[PDB]
Design a protein around this ligand. Sequence first.
Ligand SMILES: NC(=O)c1ccc[n+]([C@@H]2O[C@H](COP(=O)([O-])OP(=O)(O)OC[C@H]3O[C@@H](n4cnc5c(N)ncnc54)[C@H](O)[C@@H]3O)[C@@H](O)[C@H]2O)c1
Ligand SMILES: NC(=O)c1ccc[n+]([C@@H]2O[C@H](COP(=O)([O-])OP(=O)(O)OC[C@H]3O[C@@H](n4cnc5c(N)ncnc54)[C@H](O)[C@@H]3O)[C@@H](O)[C@H]2O)c1
Lengths: 302, 302
Amino acid sequence: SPLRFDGRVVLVTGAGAGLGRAYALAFAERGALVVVNDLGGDFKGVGKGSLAADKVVEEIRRRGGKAVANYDSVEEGEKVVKTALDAFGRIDVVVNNAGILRDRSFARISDEDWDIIHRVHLRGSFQVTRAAWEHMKKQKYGRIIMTSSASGIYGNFGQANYSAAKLGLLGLANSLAIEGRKSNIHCNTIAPNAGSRMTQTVMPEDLVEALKPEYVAPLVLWLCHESCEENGGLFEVGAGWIGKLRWERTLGAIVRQKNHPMTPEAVKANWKKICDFENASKPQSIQESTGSIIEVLSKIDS
Amino acid sequence: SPLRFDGRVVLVTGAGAGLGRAYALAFAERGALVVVNDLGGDFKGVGKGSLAADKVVEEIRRRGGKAVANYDSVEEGEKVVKTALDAFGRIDVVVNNAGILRDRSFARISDEDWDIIHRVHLRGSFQVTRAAWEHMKKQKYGRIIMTSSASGIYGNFGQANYSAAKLGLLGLANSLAIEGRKSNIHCNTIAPNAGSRMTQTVMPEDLVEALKPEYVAPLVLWLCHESCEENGGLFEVGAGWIGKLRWERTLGAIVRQKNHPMTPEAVKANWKKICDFENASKPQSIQESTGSIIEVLSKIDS
Ligand SMILES: NC(=O)c1ccc[n+]([C@@H]2O[C@H](COP(=O)([O-])OP(=O)(O)OC[C@H]3O[C@@H](n4cnc5c(N)ncnc54)[C@H](O)[C@@H]3O)[C@@H](O)[C@H]2O)c1
Ligand SMILES: NC(=O)c1ccc[n+]([C@@H]2O[C@H](COP(=O)([O-])OP(=O)(O)OC[C@H]3O[C@@H](n4cnc5c(N)ncnc54)[C@H](O)[C@@H]3O)[C@@H](O)[C@H]2O)c1
């Protein structure tokens, strides 16, 4: 049976171009009432305009879908979610996608370069999501997506500001998944790969064209569907492929011995064992890691 | 041979109490010229005083080490680093440890709760580290620690603000590791467990006493030593135990077929495969993930 969104209010931030545009179209085609948010500025965080969101709303309506435009920056997240409440009377799905770039080597990152990346990516997603949250709890339904990146997950030369903001988003998502669960609110995180104005600088023209944002949209739609049970997952996605990430944790070493001072010399001596991933565990929660560490105290005293 | 720090200028932020105090004392005992930074306020980010830093400087001096105090907030990271430059003429090791808590359910996190946590933890470590960076590069020597948390790595109810900031720090560490490497500048991240004023609220009294910050200091000193080769690692640590964390990534599923639109139905139908961690890879860099995703384009065309 086809996965539909009839009667679901779906907000996509940064929906004027690239991935967000692809999301907004794909949702509206499946019957979603779509809020198309876009500030309408450039990819470095300069400017503002109605045109970017208005062009997408028009496209959606031409294709026989339902959509309204929002022109506020995600920094004003309350105002963004207000459009959903005014136009459609509810908010069911939030796709946090809005983003910009300020690439620079570390010493060269200005205060402004840091703050603008963090206000848009991380604080922006927070603002938007907090605005939707109590509505989702009262309804007992929500589906939220955070947009991280490979540069956050792995690190990347010249992108310390951006990678900090992007992995911060994952940190946010880890906690939302926990707080939303009992209320049927899910939060999941994606690390997408797509040709766009943002990636034009780093990719050859033929790659930009080939790595289509419509290769990411099907994942977003699934993770945002009522029938989806995935919660608190992190996904890498592009080209038509999808994979999932998780932490693994070494068995490690108990370096401290009863009645003896723990020294950095014992850490150094035990370094290979500390870093050995053979039979690594797959920790599921804070309780699990925190609990096993605390039980180390009694193991030493035994 | 004992691991010494004679002639190394070591800055510890938030060194007035808890883990930072334990690091400062441990460093100074091994000959380090220590800058003891502390704002001297409470654990929720209220207040300011010279007492916190002064106490620790005098304890170090009483034990026969060398130390000077700095009283600025890490928000003023240039001023904190300037103390090392003024007192000792260089900066060699930076332990970003300063932090506060603003626990609250998600809907209840105010703008001020968010901004203060992010200013201190994330923007603070950035300001401090950015101030040291060019000095480290010209010297061709640096050792940096970021302090994350299990709540950032796993998520935790009522800590969405903090967990965002704490995993943002890891994101920052991932990129610094890459940028610093060729200059003998290492950055590593720890997720510690220690009894302190911060953890008194969630742990019983006997546990606070048992989970000593002195069990974490030996890892920090090793990771900050000149003979340490570890760079870009993430470690969980407490009770006398240490472990290391890494990402694993499913082989995943190519769900797009040549000449057929990619659908959310095909994502759904392949969900088990996408989520299956059997023979999961262990991705080491952005190149590795990005490269293999791009390669999927030609695989579909073939
Ligand atoms: N494209 C990739 O390969 C890639 C990789 C990793 C992460 N990302 C992330 O995915 C998201 C989508 O990016 P894209 O590649 O489609 O870039 P894009 O520039 O094509 O589109 C981003 C959209 O966000 C909008 N935006 C920027 N600031 C805004 C603000 N304050 N308020 C509202 N809208 C704002 C832009 O106007 C634009 O419409 C971004 O968060 C980006 O950082 C993309
Ligand atoms: N104790 C744990 O189990 C645990 C777990 C995870 C993370 N952490 C992190 O470890 C670090 C230290 O934790 P702790 O348990 O020792 O806490 P603590 O409160 O005992 O010590 C924190 C110190 O940081 C200082 N500080 C706060 N804001 C500052 C600022 N703006 N500038 C300079 N100093 C400032 C405080 O004055 C205090 O002395 C924090 O980043 C904390 O978030 C601790």
